[PDB]
Amino acid sequence: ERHLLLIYTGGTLGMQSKGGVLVPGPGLVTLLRTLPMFHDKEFAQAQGLPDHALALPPASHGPRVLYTVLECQPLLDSSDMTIDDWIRIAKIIERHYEQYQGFVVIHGADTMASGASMLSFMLENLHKPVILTGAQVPIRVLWNDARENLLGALLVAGQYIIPEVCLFMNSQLFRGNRVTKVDSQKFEAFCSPNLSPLATVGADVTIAWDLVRKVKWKDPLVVHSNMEHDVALLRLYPGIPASLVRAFLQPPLKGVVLETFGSGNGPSKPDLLQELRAAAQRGLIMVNCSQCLRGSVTPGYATSLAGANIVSGLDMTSEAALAKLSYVLGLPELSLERRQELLAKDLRGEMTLP
Amino acid sequence: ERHLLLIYTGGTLGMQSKGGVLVPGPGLVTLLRTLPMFHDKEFAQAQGLPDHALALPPASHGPRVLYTVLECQPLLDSSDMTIDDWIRIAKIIERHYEQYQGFVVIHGADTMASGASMLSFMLENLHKPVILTGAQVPIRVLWNDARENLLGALLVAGQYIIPEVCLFMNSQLFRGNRVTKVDSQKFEAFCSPNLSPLATVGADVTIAWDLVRKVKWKDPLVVHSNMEHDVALLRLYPGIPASLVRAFLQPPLKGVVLETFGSGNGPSKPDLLQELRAAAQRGLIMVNCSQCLRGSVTPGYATSLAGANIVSGLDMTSEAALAKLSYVLGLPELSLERRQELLAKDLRGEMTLPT
Amino acid sequence: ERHLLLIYTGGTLGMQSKGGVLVPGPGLVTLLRTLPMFHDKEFAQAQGLPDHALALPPASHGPRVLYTVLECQPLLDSSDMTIDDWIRIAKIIERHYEQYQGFVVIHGADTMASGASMLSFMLENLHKPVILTGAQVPIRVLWNDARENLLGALLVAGQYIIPEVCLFMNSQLFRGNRVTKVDSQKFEAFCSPNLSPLATVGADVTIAWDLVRKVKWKDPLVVHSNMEHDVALLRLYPGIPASLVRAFLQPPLKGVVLETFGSGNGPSKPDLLQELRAAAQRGLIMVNCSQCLRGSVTPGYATSLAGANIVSGLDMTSEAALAKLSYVLGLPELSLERRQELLAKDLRGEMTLPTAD
Amino acid sequence: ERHLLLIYTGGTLGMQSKGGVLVPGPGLVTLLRTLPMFHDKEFAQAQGLPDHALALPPASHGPRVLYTVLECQPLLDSSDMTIDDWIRIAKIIERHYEQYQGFVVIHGADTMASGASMLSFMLENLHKPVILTGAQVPIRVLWNDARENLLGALLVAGQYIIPEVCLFMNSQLFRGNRVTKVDSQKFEAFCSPLSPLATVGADVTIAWDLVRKVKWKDPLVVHSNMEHDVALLRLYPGIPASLVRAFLQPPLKGVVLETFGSGNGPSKPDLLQELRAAAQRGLIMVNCSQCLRGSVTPGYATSLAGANIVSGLDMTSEAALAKLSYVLGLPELSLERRQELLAKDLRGEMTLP
Ligand SMILES: NC(=O)C[C@H](N)C(=O)O
Ligand SMILES: NC(=O)C[C@H](N)C(=O)O
Ligand SMILES: NC(=O)C[C@H](N)C(=O)O
Ligand SMILES: NC(=O)C[C@H](N)C(=O)O
């Protein structure tokens, strides 16, 4: 037997109609009990299990999977989630860490990538799988992607030791701090542009063990509630004025991700470069990410953004850059020089160095 | 014979190394003369052609293609381009419109999608092909994509009547106001997520004629120099504070594209919704686009951004939304209500209406 | 209410383990009754429905879907299926045609593409959806693709009028005579290389109505049991000897699909060309298909296979070519010249005739 | 300076029209001289180079690339090529091995995958790049894929030590015994259903983790001893036992059976009797999937396994056939041993589980 905690935070997976729109819907465990793929009634009575705990049917090989449903309240559309919400999820995982072998987090799709990236950083030295999942269609609608996404998440967390925050959707397991949302309607809503999926499910389960991170059994779980809240993302657009950038980078902002053009370039007009230099003097740290979905930031042009307090984001997703920035800036008592060194390392498998 | 104007504005296609970095490089026509795929010397002498004009070798079918190279100065990395630069290109095309059968614009890749979208709107009633192209590797480096991208553009503009601003890269012709840049290194750098390519080149040339827009021969070319400059793009991110949005939307900003989450959703926290409402009262217009690459903005959630002065961008690329916003806000003497109605129409094939 | 017939012929979707291997498994309706996504017990009792008939829960819009399970016997691994088996399925659909609004056929994946193609031809003037589906993992294994494939098929047949033999797998509806199997393990096992999917399912259902064939209401359903059995497929490989081709094309073979190289080319060595000419003289008809997955057979090289009794397969899948060949050769009293003309037409949406300009 | 041999065997890359159809066209070096991307005239005169030898323009760093064009005769449409033709190419590479740092082979596309696979096996202990390339459109036609495919091949062979038979098309370098042709018209004609060994874009990315290691201690052994009596047989539904019997008659020594799905076939006894009968005669059978992607695996009662049947796992059919030809051509081995070799990864063509 392996035991999982299933943390239901909201999202379309469990929504219901009200006033002609989807809103978060309670009563998940009540529904899951009625579904044989999610709950084995025979086995429950045979072992007289606590009523709070569900049991998956037996799978082909391996151990049996039991899980407990923890329904947060209120439930949220993921568009409403913030660093504080992700911290609360991390703390749930921390409190219950020793009692469970893995975790699944039902989450809205709108910001799942940001959440996966955030939790990747908050959960330092993680030793157990934390699998985020969601759906484009609610589980109470007959024709949906929720059933198989939720089951897949539970089975992955239940059967494999992948000590990472991942995202499972549509038969694929992605490294969480490598995903981004590419489709607003299709079931294949997520993509991992600069890294292979960690796993694929088909006739057989294929796992890229060469990529999966190693359990650090000597080191304890350290949860970072100290995440800098004053970080932002700024997408450059052609002719963006210096005056607007000035306003954006005003105190109390401590860090910013600049999504630049192509291989990491921006306008070379002086008044704009002046504002970035000015913000560097105030102590602001800047990470340069590409607006492009695929590829890396690299030097090479006269228009490349580099210099005082600018760190290259290489091939990071913006969601990962923002989370890493929040993480590093939240660390206590470090020199700005040291903070920059950390931003330039691969801390959770989110960045590929050359 | 068909004659094209080749407008060289800059970009990696023609860059050179200097101080260990790529910068714009002059002298394109000088190089192209030396290349047999770009200039047929035999034919030039046989017709004693003007020295400014180049001739492509004969192609499989069709008419012969001649072209003239117009090298803008200064040349620019496309990261430095703005609405003003694209207006200048539109005006070049306007001045020379009657003398040429089509146009090719060599452009940097970093903002090509914005430029294509802008020109799409500026060139009202366009009757001739305007093909933007560029490269990930300069044409003076041996192993490059520039040669074939430039030749392809010239052949497409030279041989076909596609009255659209397009982008040609890597054997594909895209509708210009439908493209976006998806890869910063690969030769397949561009994608048209919510529309088929207009053409594909292989052994044969396949054109999606049932998508290509129809020539309106009665209507003259109207070039819009009146493009609103005070427009912006704002990407939402989780927990973006009201205070920051307030600062972003301060006068003199007239219009903004909000890149929202998923099917067009954002935080429902009241202080943020109050700033958008406040900006609507000041007269600002907002277009709601998805941060997602593929798919459409649609209502359906309690978190959907809709209401006063917010227009759904449906399946538009952000580059197209920004350009359309610039276009509509630059039109003279319209009510704010009318401006919104125009934003909700398909003006250049950039948006697909539901039905 | 719309009523469907669910024809369970076998395949991995319903297999069980025995001696460490998967074999066909009976008792489908018994399992489906226990599954709330497949059977609404409340509604069944509320309308006191016949015990043989299942009811899907209500869906977002549209009518309610009821269905009857017909479990063929014996059940088969699709690797064992032949023209005779597909004829039996066509005849089941014929007998029950008027009682039901659509059909779903649970079928093994190994030859689903051949079966879809065969049924496409056998069911002339079809007016109702016939949706084939299957799975890479059996429905009794917990982590599987069967649940969603079967539900999807039922919902597509139940809710839309697509008068075609289709294949539904992994959220996509393909034209059946356009599919081929491209992956032996992934759930995305099928691909339609020279045609778009007819439909895609996501948050919403998108249907390519511009491609879906039109119902011919005036014309009755004609089922062709007269399918020529003596047809074969022959894949060319470099240096394939004339002697081997000779042996392959011996009587009683009436038709063959030659899978050739690239744009439809083969060796020009004379002894080989002589065997094809010899077989043409015996009255054999040959269809030339490309080994390539995507693209078309076209003339252009000195190595292009063309001539006596050879018809270009253009962009047909080999599965479709073989079925069309079986269909056309089974038609009664036609000249060989006429048979060839029919092979060169688009009879069921399986072939795209080349564009002029 | 690095020197390459460019072996022009034929194919569309160099074809010309005649009687309204494409046929092989001679005079490649004559054309390439006139093209600045392919020949640097300044540099040629500056070093007074032999007239037979061409010089690519420089890149910034790295060495300069010179190459010699060897035009086979007659030139062939690849549809006409056989084991004998690929042996001849291997022997050209053997004779000139010491004089050149790499090789490029211009080849027709129709059977390039078979040829790449064959050469992969023939060229045991290969230490230098052998890059096959071709085109969907002839180089003399203005809008074509030939120019960039040929240049790419020369630059890859000239600049990198990838001791493998590869195929370069459309900005990608594939392991040769892993490719297959998926499109008959598009420039993206080939697919490796394994990662590409390299990709060319703004930068060149090479998957060094996959590229095989040079064995400098071991000499190049060229196998002319390739079994010719091997065949490929694609199963189709209801294929009769009588037809399979005829196909597997002597003198056939080996056959690749392209089976359904994960490696399955009809379980009807008369058919299984013919495969067993052929095994008794000494025939060896490799089971490959008709599917493009994935692996042959046991699991069903319909899986073809047993006497003298070896699983092809994830091999392409082109690789299975070539490996079968290779193994059967080896002298004095027991049939058991031949089967063990078929089940190993000999040239990177097969992934073991
Ligand atoms: N599909 C989803 O989950 C979208 C939903 N608005 C959410 O993020 O909560
Ligand atoms: N590939 C390119 O052209 C990049 C260049 N920085 C530009 O956009 O001008
Ligand atoms: N996935 C499957 O159904 C394969 C099985 N051998 C069959 O075709 O019956
Ligand atoms: N593209 C090509 O090269 C096709 C040609 N028929 C050949 O294989 O020789």
Side-chain angles (χ1 to χ4, degrees):
Chain A
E1 295 186 353
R2 308 231 317 165
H3 311 246
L4 308 178
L5 183 63
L6 174 56
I7 303 171
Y8 172 40
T9 73
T12 297
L13 185 145
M15 287 194 181
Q16 276 148 225
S17 297
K18 180 174 176 180
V21 295
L22 294 171
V23 302
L28 180 64
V29 69
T30 295
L31 169 60
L32 297 186
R33 275 198 158 267
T34 72
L35 299 180
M37 63 182 296
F38 284 109
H39 187 46
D40 188 334
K41 268 162 168 162
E42 269 196 59
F43 183 91
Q45 293 174 223
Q47 314 298 335
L49 293 177
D51 49 52
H52 65 97
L54 306 192
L56 292 185
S60 297
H61 314 282
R64 193 132 192 169
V65 176
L66 312 180
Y67 61 102
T68 301
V69 180
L70 188 170
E71 183 159 315
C72 298
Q73 205 82 216
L75 297 164
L76 297 171
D77 187 298
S78 74
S79 289
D80 285 310
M81 292 187 80
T82 63
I83 287 157
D84 286 325
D85 294 303
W86 293 313
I87 289 169
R88 276 188 277 288
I89 292 167
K91 294 299 262 173
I92 288 173
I93 293 163
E94 194 192 12
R95 284 180 187 176
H96 298 285
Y97 198 56
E98 309 292 351
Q99 307 166 248
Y100 294 100
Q101 282 75 67
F103 305 83
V104 170
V105 177
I106 295 162
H107 196 285
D110 291 344
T111 60
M112 215 186 297
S114 288
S117 293
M118 285 287 172
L119 289 169
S120 183
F121 281 92
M122 292 171 193
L123 298 175
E124 192 182 8
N125 305 315
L126 176 68
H127 308 96
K128 310 177 186 202
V130 174
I131 313 303
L132 277 74
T133 194
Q136 297 279 45
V137 184
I139 196 161
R140 281 179 199 282
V141 172
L142 179 60
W143 209 357
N144 71 63
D145 56 328
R147 281 181 296 265
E148 306 307 335
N149 285 347
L150 179 54
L151 181 65
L154 291 163
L155 289 173
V156 167
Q159 296 190 304
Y160 302 92
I161 292 176
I162 292 165
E164 293 205 44
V165 179
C166 306
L167 167 48
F168 181 84
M169 296 272 291
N170 192 47
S171 302
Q172 308 231 92
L173 188 71
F174 300 104
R175 171 169 294 153
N177 61 35
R178 290 282 195 167
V179 288
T180 189
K181 200 182 204 289
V182 296
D183 209 300
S184 49
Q185 272 85 32
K186 282 168 131 66
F187 294 154
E188 195 181 332
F190 289 92
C191 148
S192 164
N194 294 304
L195 193 85
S196 290
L198 299 181
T200 303
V201 185
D204 37 23
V205 171
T206 305
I207 296 173
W209 289 111
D210 44 308
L211 294 176
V212 173
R213 292 162 70 74
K214 308 294 189 186
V215 175
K216 286 170 285 135
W217 47 275
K218 308 174 173 286
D219 302 321
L221 179 74
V222 187
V223 171
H224 292 249
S225 311
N226 53 314
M227 296 285 288
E228 180 57 63
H229 286 60
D230 295 316
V231 295
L233 181 133
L234 178 68
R235 178 161 283 218
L236 301 187
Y237 59 88
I240 184 171
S243 56
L244 195 59
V245 170
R246 186 163 56 254
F248 202 87
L249 304 177
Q250 283 309 285
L253 188 74
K254 305 287 195 305
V256 69
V257 177
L258 301 167
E259 294 186 316
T260 54
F261 310 128
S263 63
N265 311 326
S268 60
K269 59 173 179 269
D271 57 349
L272 184 87
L273 295 184
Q274 268 329 75
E275 293 305 332
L276 300 177
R277 195 167 321 126
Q281 284 182 295
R282 293 195 296 272
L284 185 96
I285 293 168
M286 292 161 278
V287 173
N288 176 350
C289 284
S290 182
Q291 286 176 18
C292 300
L293 185 81
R294 259 167 179 88
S296 190
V297 167
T298 74
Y301 296 96
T303 50
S304 311
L305 284 195
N309 295 24
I310 294 161
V311 184
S312 168
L314 293 176
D315 62 333
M316 282 196 292
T317 66
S318 291
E319 297 93 323
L322 198 50
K324 190 198 227 152
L325 197 55
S326 183
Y327 174 85
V328 167
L329 294 185
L331 296 174
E333 287 151 17
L334 299 181
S335 77
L336 173 144
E337 304 91 284
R338 181 54 184 165
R339 292 181 193 287
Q340 290 186 248
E341 290 165 359
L342 292 173
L343 290 165
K345 317 189 103 194
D346 177 19
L347 303 172
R348 302 282 191 279
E350 77 286 345
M351 193 166 71
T352 311
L353 305 162
Chain B
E1 295 185 354
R2 308 231 317 165
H3 304 66
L4 309 178
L5 183 63
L6 174 56
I7 303 172
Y8 171 41
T9 74
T12 298
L13 184 144
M15 286 194 181
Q16 275 148 224
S17 296
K18 179 175 175 180
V21 295
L22 295 171
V23 302
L28 179 65
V29 69
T30 295
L31 170 59
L32 296 186
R33 276 197 158 267
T34 72
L35 299 179
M37 63 182 295
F38 285 107
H39 186 47
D40 187 333
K41 267 163 168 163
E42 269 195 59
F43 183 91
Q45 293 173 221
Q47 315 297 335
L49 293 177
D51 213 50
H52 65 97
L54 306 191
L56 293 184
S60 299
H61 75 278
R64 193 132 192 170
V65 176
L66 313 180
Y67 60 103
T68 302
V69 180
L70 189 169
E71 183 159 316
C72 297
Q73 207 81 216
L75 299 165
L76 297 169
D77 185 298
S78 74
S79 289
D80 286 309
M81 293 187 80
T82 63
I83 287 158
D84 286 325
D85 294 302
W86 292 313
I87 290 168
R88 277 187 277 286
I89 292 166
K91 296 299 262 174
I92 288 174
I93 292 163
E94 195 192 14
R95 284 179 231 124
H96 298 285
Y97 198 57
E98 309 292 352
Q99 308 165 247
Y100 293 100
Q101 282 75 66
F103 305 84
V104 170
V105 176
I106 294 162
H107 195 284
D110 291 346
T111 61
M112 214 187 297
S114 290
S117 292
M118 284 287 172
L119 289 170
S120 183
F121 281 92
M122 292 171 193
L123 298 175
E124 193 181 9
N125 306 314
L126 177 67
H127 310 96
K128 310 178 185 202
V130 174
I131 313 303
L132 276 75
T133 195
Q136 296 278 48
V137 184
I139 197 161
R140 281 179 199 281
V141 171
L142 181 61
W143 208 357
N144 71 64
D145 54 329
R147 282 182 295 267
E148 308 306 336
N149 284 348
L150 179 54
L151 181 64
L154 289 163
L155 290 172
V156 166
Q159 297 188 307
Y160 302 95
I161 294 175
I162 292 164
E164 292 204 45
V165 179
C166 307
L167 185 149
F168 181 84
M169 295 272 291
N170 193 47
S171 302
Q172 307 232 94
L173 189 71
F174 300 106
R175 172 169 294 152
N177 62 34
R178 290 283 196 166
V179 288
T180 189
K181 201 180 204 290
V182 295
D183 209 300
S184 49
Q185 272 84 32
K186 282 168 131 66
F187 293 152
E188 194 182 332
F190 290 91
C191 148
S192 165
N194 295 304
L195 192 85
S196 290
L198 297 182
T200 303
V201 185
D204 286 288
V205 173
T206 304
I207 296 173
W209 289 112
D210 303 317
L211 294 175
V212 172
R213 292 163 70 73
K214 307 294 189 186
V215 175
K216 288 169 283 135
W217 50 276
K218 305 175 171 286
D219 301 323
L221 178 75
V222 186
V223 170
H224 290 248
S225 310
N226 54 313
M227 296 285 288
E228 179 58 62
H229 285 61
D230 294 317
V231 294
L233 181 133
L234 177 68
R235 179 160 283 218
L236 301 187
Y237 59 89
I240 183 172
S243 56
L244 195 59
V245 170
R246 185 167 185 266
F248 202 88
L249 305 176
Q250 282 309 284
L253 187 74
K254 304 287 195 306
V256 70
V257 177
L258 301 167
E259 294 186 316
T260 54
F261 310 128
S263 64
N265 311 323
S268 59
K269 60 172 178 269
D271 57 350
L272 183 88
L273 295 184
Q274 189 52 52
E275 293 304 333
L276 299 177
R277 196 165 318 114
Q281 287 167 333
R282 294 194 295 273
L284 184 97
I285 293 168
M286 293 161 278
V287 173
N288 175 351
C289 283
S290 182
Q291 287 176 17
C292 301
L293 185 82
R294 258 180 271 119
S296 191
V297 166
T298 75
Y301 296 95
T303 49
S304 310
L305 282 194
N309 297 23
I310 295 161
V311 183
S312 168
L314 293 176
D315 63 333
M316 283 196 291
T317 66
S318 291
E319 297 93 323
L322 199 51
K324 190 198 226 152
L325 197 56
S326 184
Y327 173 86
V328 167
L329 294 186
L331 296 174
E333 286 151 14
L334 300 180
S335 76
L336 288 160
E337 305 92 284
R338 181 55 184 163
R339 291 181 191 288
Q340 291 188 55
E341 292 163 3
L342 292 173
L343 290 165
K345 317 189 103 194
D346 178 20
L347 303 172
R348 302 282 191 278
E350 77 286 345
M351 193 166 71
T352 311
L353 304 163
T355 198
Chain C
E1 295 186 354
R2 308 231 317 164
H3 311 246
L4 309 178
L5 183 62
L6 175 56
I7 303 171
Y8 171 42
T9 73
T12 297
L13 184 145
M15 286 194 182
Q16 39 155 15
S17 296
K18 179 174 176 180
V21 294
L22 295 171
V23 302
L28 179 64
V29 69
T30 296
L31 169 60
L32 296 186
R33 273 203 257 277
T34 72
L35 300 180
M37 63 182 295
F38 285 109
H39 187 47
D40 187 334
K41 267 162 168 162
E42 270 194 59
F43 183 91
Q45 293 173 221
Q47 314 295 136
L49 293 177
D51 213 51
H52 65 97
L54 306 192
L56 293 184
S60 299
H61 314 282
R64 193 133 192 167
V65 175
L66 313 180
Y67 61 103
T68 302
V69 180
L70 190 169
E71 182 159 315
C72 297
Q73 177 170 215
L75 298 166
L76 297 169
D77 186 296
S78 74
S79 288
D80 287 309
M81 292 188 80
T82 64
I83 288 157
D84 285 325
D85 293 302
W86 293 311
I87 289 169
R88 276 188 277 286
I89 293 166
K91 296 300 262 173
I92 289 174
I93 293 163
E94 195 191 13
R95 284 179 230 121
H96 298 283
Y97 199 57
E98 308 291 349
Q99 307 166 245
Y100 294 101
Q101 281 75 66
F103 304 82
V104 170
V105 176
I106 295 162
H107 196 284
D110 291 346
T111 61
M112 215 187 297
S114 288
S117 293
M118 285 286 172
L119 289 169
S120 181
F121 281 92
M122 293 171 193
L123 299 175
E124 192 180 9
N125 305 314
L126 178 67
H127 309 96
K128 310 178 185 202
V130 174
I131 313 303
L132 276 74
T133 194
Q136 296 278 48
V137 185
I139 198 160
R140 282 179 199 281
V141 172
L142 180 60
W143 208 357
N144 71 64
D145 55 328
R147 281 182 296 265
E148 308 307 335
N149 283 349
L150 179 53
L151 182 64
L154 289 163
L155 290 172
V156 166
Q159 297 189 306
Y160 301 94
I161 294 176
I162 293 164
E164 293 205 45
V165 179
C166 306
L167 184 149
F168 181 83
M169 295 272 291
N170 192 48
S171 302
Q172 308 231 92
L173 189 71
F174 300 104
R175 171 170 295 154
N177 60 35
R178 290 284 195 165
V179 288
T180 188
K181 200 181 204 289
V182 295
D183 208 301
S184 49
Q185 271 85 31
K186 282 168 132 66
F187 292 153
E188 194 183 329
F190 289 91
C191 148
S192 166
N194 294 305
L195 192 86
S196 291
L198 298 182
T200 304
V201 184
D204 33 28
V205 172
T206 306
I207 296 173
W209 289 111
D210 44 307
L211 296 175
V212 173
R213 292 162 70 73
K214 308 294 189 186
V215 175
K216 288 169 283 135
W217 276 115
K218 307 175 171 286
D219 301 322
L221 179 75
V222 186
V223 171
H224 292 249
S225 310
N226 53 315
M227 297 285 289
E228 180 57 62
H229 286 59
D230 295 317
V231 295
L233 181 133
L234 178 68
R235 179 161 283 218
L236 301 187
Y237 59 89
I240 183 172
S243 55
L244 197 60
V245 170
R246 184 162 54 262
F248 204 87
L249 305 177
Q250 283 309 284
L253 188 74
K254 304 286 196 305
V256 69
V257 176
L258 301 167
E259 294 186 315
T260 54
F261 309 129
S263 63
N265 312 324
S268 60
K269 60 172 178 269
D271 56 350
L272 183 88
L273 295 184
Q274 187 54 52
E275 294 305 333
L276 300 178
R277 186 211 136 88
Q281 285 175 149
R282 296 194 295 274
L284 187 96
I285 294 168
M286 292 162 278
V287 174
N288 175 348
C289 284
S290 182
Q291 287 176 21
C292 301
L293 185 81
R294 259 168 178 87
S296 191
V297 166
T298 74
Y301 297 96
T303 50
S304 311
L305 283 194
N309 297 21
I310 294 161
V311 184
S312 169
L314 294 175
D315 62 333
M316 283 195 291
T317 67
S318 291
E319 296 93 323
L322 198 51
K324 189 198 226 152
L325 197 55
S326 183
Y327 174 85
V328 167
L329 295 186
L331 295 175
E333 286 152 14
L334 300 180
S335 76
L336 174 144
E337 304 91 283
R338 181 55 183 164
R339 291 182 192 288
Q340 290 186 249
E341 291 165 0
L342 291 174
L343 289 165
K345 316 190 103 194
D346 177 21
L347 303 172
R348 302 283 191 276
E350 77 286 346
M351 193 167 71
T352 310
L353 304 162
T355 276
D357 66 287
Chain D
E1 295 186 354
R2 309 232 313 161
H3 303 67
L4 309 177
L5 183 62
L6 174 55
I7 303 172
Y8 171 41
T9 73
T12 296
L13 184 145
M15 286 195 182
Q16 276 148 224
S17 296
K18 180 173 177 180
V21 294
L22 295 171
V23 301
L28 179 64
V29 69
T30 295
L31 170 59
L32 296 187
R33 275 197 159 267
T34 70
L35 299 180
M37 62 182 296
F38 284 109
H39 187 47
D40 187 334
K41 267 162 168 162
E42 269 197 58
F43 183 91
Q45 293 173 223
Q47 314 296 137
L49 293 177
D51 213 50
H52 65 97
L54 305 191
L56 293 184
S60 300
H61 310 281
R64 192 133 193 168
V65 175
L66 312 180
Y67 60 102
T68 301
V69 181
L70 189 170
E71 183 159 315
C72 297
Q73 206 81 47
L75 297 164
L76 296 170
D77 187 297
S78 73
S79 288
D80 286 310
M81 292 188 81
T82 63
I83 287 158
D84 285 325
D85 294 303
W86 294 312
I87 288 169
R88 276 188 277 286
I89 292 167
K91 287 179 159 174
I92 289 174
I93 292 163
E94 194 192 13
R95 284 180 185 151
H96 298 285
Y97 197 57
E98 309 292 350
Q99 306 166 249
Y100 295 101
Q101 281 75 64
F103 304 84
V104 170
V105 177
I106 295 163
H107 195 285
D110 290 344
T111 60
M112 216 187 297
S114 291
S117 293
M118 284 286 172
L119 289 170
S120 183
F121 282 91
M122 293 170 193
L123 298 175
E124 193 180 9
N125 305 315
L126 177 67
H127 309 96
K128 310 177 185 203
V130 174
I131 313 303
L132 278 74
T133 194
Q136 296 278 46
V137 183
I139 197 161
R140 281 178 198 281
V141 171
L142 179 61
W143 185 256
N144 69 64
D145 55 328
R147 281 182 297 264
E148 308 306 335
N149 285 348
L150 178 54
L151 181 65
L154 291 163
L155 289 172
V156 167
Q159 296 189 307
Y160 301 93
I161 293 176
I162 292 165
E164 293 205 45
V165 179
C166 306
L167 184 148
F168 182 83
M169 296 272 292
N170 192 47
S171 301
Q172 308 231 92
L173 190 70
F174 300 104
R175 171 169 294 153
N177 60 35
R178 290 283 196 167
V179 288
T180 189
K181 201 181 204 289
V182 295
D183 208 299
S184 49
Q185 272 85 32
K186 282 168 132 66
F187 294 154
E188 193 183 329
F190 289 91
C191 148
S192 165
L194 194 83
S195 291
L197 299 182
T199 303
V200 184
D203 35 23
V204 172
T205 305
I206 296 174
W208 289 111
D209 43 308
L210 294 175
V211 173
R212 292 162 70 73
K213 309 295 188 186
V214 176
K215 288 169 284 135
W216 254 126
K217 62 187 170 17
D218 302 322
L220 178 75
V221 186
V222 170
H223 292 249
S224 310
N225 53 315
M226 296 285 289
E227 179 58 62
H228 284 60
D229 295 316
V230 295
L232 181 134
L233 178 68
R234 179 161 283 219
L235 300 187
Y236 60 88
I239 183 171
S242 56
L243 196 59
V244 170
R245 185 164 55 255
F247 203 88
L248 305 176
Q249 282 309 285
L252 188 74
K253 304 287 195 305
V255 70
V256 175
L257 301 166
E258 294 186 315
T259 54
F260 309 130
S262 63
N264 311 324
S267 59
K268 60 173 178 269
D270 56 349
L271 183 88
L272 295 184
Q273 265 145 45
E274 295 305 334
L275 300 177
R276 197 166 317 113
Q280 286 168 334
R281 295 194 295 273
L283 185 96
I284 293 168
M285 291 162 278
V286 173
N287 175 351
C288 283
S289 181
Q290 288 176 19
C291 302
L292 185 81
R293 258 172 157 212
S295 191
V296 165
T297 74
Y300 295 97
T302 49
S303 309
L304 283 195
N308 296 21
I309 294 161
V310 184
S311 169
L313 293 175
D314 63 331
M315 282 196 290
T316 66
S317 291
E318 297 93 322
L321 199 50
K323 190 199 225 152
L324 197 54
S325 183
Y326 174 86
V327 167
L328 293 186
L330 296 174
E332 287 147 14
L333 299 181
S334 76
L335 173 145
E336 173 154 83
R337 181 54 183 164
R338 290 181 192 287
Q339 290 188 57
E340 291 165 0
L341 291 174
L342 290 164
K344 314 190 103 194
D345 178 21
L346 303 172
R347 302 283 191 277
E349 76 286 343
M350 192 166 72
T351 312
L352 305 162

